[PDB]
Design a protein around this ligand. Structure first.
Ligand code: IUP
Ligand code: IUP
Ligand code: IUP
Ligand code: IUP
Lengths: 295, 295, 295, 295
């Protein structure tokens, strides 16, 4: 037998960083959860009890904190690139570093209509994420995403004209609820190294903001034919607004809200045009995916 | 043996309701999770297999949906009072109804700076809750709360002057992070019935808004001596602003963020005035509680 | 305003302890999560920023570990009593200690049919818990429980003869699935102090074992008229087998499994006597409670 | 722009099935959660609002239940193969079906030492899973796994000889706790279709049982040099015992249990040979992966 694939490292590393402007008093906070997994000439740790090739996961943890102390942690695409580059540069025998970062929201509070210098609210469980793969001789591959953006529209969603056969019970509808948890990922052009990543730094926040804005506006404004048709519109708009993106991926649950027929009770009308009270369904759920690129 | 206490009903009933203004096109959505547990002359269902005394939990579920169809679901204090009153009025042998409602956030989206007529975002996992106990001959007892309001301040929190003995390792501090998940409950004067609840309806939203505003402003502005001292200030302010409240309760975790000494690595300074990178601790956590009333 | 109630302490303290028999080589492990909340003459910490009255939560954490080092951690009723007694004895101004312990399963592995001396499996997420309230001048009040014991029976459950009115849609049944997550609590006679608790130590494990055995056998063997009727039988049997218990409480969800009518598809018969495939319902759920004592 | 990848279907479909032996009275239950995602000539649903190509997710759900009614649900490798084959055979334009099944434990109860005919316990949250990819013209690719198997050993784990540099603080150890949640996956030889899968049916349960037995015995008996070295031994043994497997993958967290130095308190000795009380760490955690194949 032989090792066909191996990677190892530290997961679930919680990290907070504060920036303090001593002149103005304004403080800014960042909070993340980090995973770093390494690949390289490590097979003998598995096959021969050779720990000499292992950079201890505890040391990887230390390195995450040290790197956060010595560098900006934002945008996460940059921080992940710095962190990944460190491992392949420091350790000859390590040839890839896979860095995942989940960024947690700490939005500055407004108190009596003024932004507070050092108080923050977790205004959503929505995350901003990166997956940064630094592979020796193959540059830096970055996938950026937003996830856990939970939305609902109460009308201007439709679903009709789908295939109907002996397995089909679903009624066509011209007016339904649509609710989802948005997971949207944009995949960057390969970067040659850390200089090229740095050269594009403003594009990371700008493209996240575009992706979020497009997602929300398209969801709100599209009189949706299906989840498929709506998500495609989102993806094509994001591609049109950032040429350094190669693909956009969406993964969207269809979180169903069922009508409740109450006509058995005193003739109460709660379906069709009279539908007001619905049963949110926890499971099952539709799950709709696509990856859009340029033609 | 004998039944000393018993209650039963339906838990985890998810409910959505939409309001549609046909004139303006503006739709408004409400989403809840409801629990109704009943008490009364039901002991023989337990002791004698006498199901005749059981209003089926499935029927309780139906009743929740019917009541939501026929009544406003907001404020939740009112909806819970209507729902609880129904069971003690409809069923002679039922003498108490215990209604818990968790209200989920669906905040109207702003698209290109304008409120959208039918699209919403789950802008926080913060909840607004009620616990409405309708007890025959004893009126309606309402506890209102907000929960899951997660906040952090990066300075202007202190903790010194605490007891020090042979069990103490904690260093005094004059500048630390404070983060919590706020659970705040206000307990209303007993109401005699549904007419009295209705007579105070505007006070429910107003008092929730006050509790939230006071919580946030006090957290942000108090140069905190301890969680204890800060939460007391919140409670006393809320009591001062609504005379129909009898008590205010807070339950606050102290979600610790630990300094990370990095001086073992190249003399890096990351403690005290130089502390920038911290380790958020998932557990354990301080837990600080108090109930404040009038003197 | 004034403090009507207050308690504070450390929650979510994870604790592991190992016992090593050096003669035999057999090791035994214990793992818990502990919460200790204190009450006493602490109001000035809330009202006057008086931290002198606060035993720091960090110190409470230290004390949990020290107490575990110096004492048995089993049975949890004893450990909680020792821990709670410590705080009211050590600190004049502390007058109650509220100790909650959740015990996690680490069941010894059998390898090739022989018990292994130092390897364990989490064989269930079922917990054994205690709530120990040590109140100065009022002894030690102990509630013991098992929770998260998830069971299902595929027949020999019935539900008919329940109240039927204009809110009722549920069909009577003489053969259904019954599934629940058992939460069972037995409340001990008040103990005067730690000597009396110690004097009954073997009864704690024995009564937990009885409660579990009775729960499982009654669930399996009772041709159940309702959740109410079955749980009452469990409680009365446990009371009959331990005179130092005063009450037994059950809280049982009815985790519904719905039939699926498939007759619209090629006349497939999947209801009544032909029911084989069911839809487990995540929510809502019945919730059935009772507390049984002696007559 | 163009669709580079797309798949869609129904996730989180809970399914129960009962088998009743009318002769013996013995009933046997199965419970799963199923996901089916389809690929094919579906791009126009995304690009042109063409729903004619969509087999509704609701219909996919119906099909899961119908297929469970008409076929065995065990072993899950077979059920998933039947289910996936159905979609590519029934719908000309569907060219792949991706079926994920999570099997939940319902272990028959023993009551008074005898197996009960119709009562079951969730004896572990450990799962048995399959991932069955049925791809038209490319047969059936099956990955089988066990997950959520949580174990701990209290000694006979070591970690020394790892790389030490300026990022390293971890002390070498010759005696530590090792705890993990086992996720083990075995990848089958490609099967040409459903006849070939059926021809190997007994091997599915047998290989799951082997994987579990090997995992537990190796964990318990290996005086472990590292997680890496132990997991490799597991994988090579499983490969040796089933020639129709091509690879075995493990993904193992190192769930750390930290010593607690208590020497600051009355000289208490709780480290090294005197270590009895430990602090389980919820995060971060090592994460160790490898895929082993034949040479
Ligand atoms: O039943 C279905 N209803 C749906 N709605 C939709 O927008 N697209 C689908 O493909 C569908 O996904 O959930 N299938
Ligand atoms: O160690 C402690 N640190 C704390 N901080 C605080 O504000 N009050 C406490 O009582 C304390 O709660 O967490 N105990
Ligand atoms: O609809 C109901 N079905 C039930 N079954 C039961 O055993 N008792 C109830 O009171 C019931 O609880 O779930 N209500
Ligand atoms: O600090 C470390 N300690 C570990 N133990 C181990 O068995 N292997 C590692 O590579 C290690 O993973 O957790 N890194």
């Amino acid at each position: 037998s032989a090792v066909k694939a191996a990677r190892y490292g530290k997961d679930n590393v919680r990290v907070y960083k504060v920036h303090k402007d001593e002149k103005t008093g304004v403080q800014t906070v960042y909070e993340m959860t980090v995973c770093v997994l390494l690949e390289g000439e490590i097979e003998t740790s598995y096959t021969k009890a050779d720990n000499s090739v292992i950079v201890a996961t505890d040391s990887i943890k230390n390195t995450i904190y040290i790197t956060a102390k010595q560098n900006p942690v934002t945008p996460p695409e940059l921080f992940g690139s710095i962190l990944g580059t460190h491992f392949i540069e420091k350790y000859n025998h390590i040839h890839a570093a896979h860095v995942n970062i989940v960024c947690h929201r700490w939005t500055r509070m407004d108190i009596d209509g003024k932004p507070h210098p050092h108080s923050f609210i977790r205004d959503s469980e929505e995350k901003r994420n990166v997956q940064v793969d630094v592979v020796e001789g193959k540059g830096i591959d970055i996938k950026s995403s937003l996830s856990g953006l939970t939305v609902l529209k109460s009308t201007n969603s439709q679903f009709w004209g789908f295939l109907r056969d002996e397995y089909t019970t679903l009624k066509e509808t011209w007016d339904r609820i649509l609710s989802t948890d948005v997971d949207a990922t944009w995949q960057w052009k390969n970067f040659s190294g850390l200089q090229e990543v740095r050269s594009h730094v403003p594009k990371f926040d700008a493209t996240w903001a575009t992706a979020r804005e497009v997602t929300l506006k398209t969801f709100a404004e599209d009189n949706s034919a299906s989840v498929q048709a709506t998500m495609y519109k989102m993806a094509e708009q994001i591609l049109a607004r950032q040429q350094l993106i190669e693909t956009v991926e969406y993964s969207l649950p269809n979180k169903h809200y069922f009508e409740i027929d109450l006509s058995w009770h005193k003739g109460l009308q709660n379906t069709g045009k009279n539908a007001e009270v619905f049963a949110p369904q926890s499971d099952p759920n539709g799950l709709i995916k696509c990856t859009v690129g340029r033609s």
